[PDB]
């Protein structure tokens, strides 16, 4: 135990936390702001690169019909194997 503790980074300075929802929403707002202007047509490769893959992935998530339960990604406690909630 004590010997194992010697293999840690020794210059940790600061830790910041952010919810996935929050920064995903902020990123989407940035993307909408930069892809909104008229001088970037929807058929341009840049716009499709920005939008199509995200749309496809979100559609795949929505279509999902799984017989098992996937525990919430951001639970308070994910260390207990016998408690998915």
């Amino acid at each position: 135990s004590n010997p194992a503790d010697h293999f840690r980074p020794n210059l940790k300075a600061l830790t910041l936390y952010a919810e996935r929802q929050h920064y995903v929403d902020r990123w989407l707002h940035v993307k909408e702001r930069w892809l909104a202007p008229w001088y970037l047509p929807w058929w341009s490769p840049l716009f499709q690169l920005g939008t199509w893959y995200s749309q496809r992935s979100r559609n795949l998530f929505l279509v999902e019909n799984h017989l098992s339960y996937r525990p919430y990604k951001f639970r308070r406690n994910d260390e207990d194997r016998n408690n998915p909630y």
Binding site: P3, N10, L11, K12, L14, T15, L16
Partner: protein, 231 residues
């Protein structure tokens, strides 16, 4: 979660800036074989077979600045994590593999089907092909696992032996003034011998492990190189 931290190379970066503001010749390289792939003259390769030299040199420098200096007490190997090493080896290995695959030459993989036409194709040759394709990925995994395990085991042993030496040196040196001084002197001499032996072994093993780390990547590259003969 975003953790802000720093590597343990800042003093070494300072020394590099101080001592390499002017040019110097380099004549000793840990893995020299990346520079000499072809040994028979008149053989040449149309593939960029010397693309690995720069990455090899930088990787050697980085891993040496970390691993060799880690023998100094309290020096930290900042990257010592299993999955981080997996990421590094994944980058190098998969990048070269995708370089060969993007070539869109399927004949390059003909050698994967092991054996000759005499051997049954479905029950022998195809199972050998399956095993060889598995072995490529296993070589990647073994490379990164071998690099991680050597550092971890060596430093665990060093820490434990140092703890024992501190214990006996601090709490049993008084025996020098006692009648059992000969036993303590024997033990102390044995500990000094063990100290020197461990340090020499670690120094040799670090360099050798870097050599093998680069050799695995170069072997991946060499397995798919084809040489033309000048006429």
């Amino acid at each position: 979660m975003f953790l802000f931290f720093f590597c343990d190379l800042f003093w070494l970066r300072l020394l590099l800036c101080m001592y390499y503001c002017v040019w110097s010749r380099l004549c000793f390289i840990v893995y020299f074989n990346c520079l000499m792939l072809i040994f028979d003259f008149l053989l040449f390769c149309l593939f960029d077979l010397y693309l690995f030299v720069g990455l090899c040199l930088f990787l050697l420098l980085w891993f040496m600045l970390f691993n060799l200096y880690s023998l100094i007490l309290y020096y930290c190997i900042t990257y010592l994590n299993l999955y981080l090493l997996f990421c590094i080896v994944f980058l190098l290995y998969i990048a070269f593999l995708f370089l060969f695959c993007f070539l869109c030459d399927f004949f390059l993989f003909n050698n994967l089907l092991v054996g000759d036409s005499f051997m049954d194709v479905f029950f022998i040759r195809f199972l050998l092909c399956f095993l060889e394709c598995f072995s490529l990925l296993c070589r990647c995994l073994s490379t990164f696992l071998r690099l991680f395990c050597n550092l971890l085991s060596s430093h665990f042993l060093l820490l434990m032996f140092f703890d024992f030496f501190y214990f006996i040196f601090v709490f049993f040196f008084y025996g020098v003034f006692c009648y059992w001084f000969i036993l303590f002197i024997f033990v102390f001499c044995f500990c000094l011998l063990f100290y020197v032996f461990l340090y020499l072994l670690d120094l040799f093993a670090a360099i050798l492990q870097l050599f093998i780390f680069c050799n695995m990547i170069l072997q991946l590259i060499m397995d798919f190189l084809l040489f033309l003969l000048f006429v």
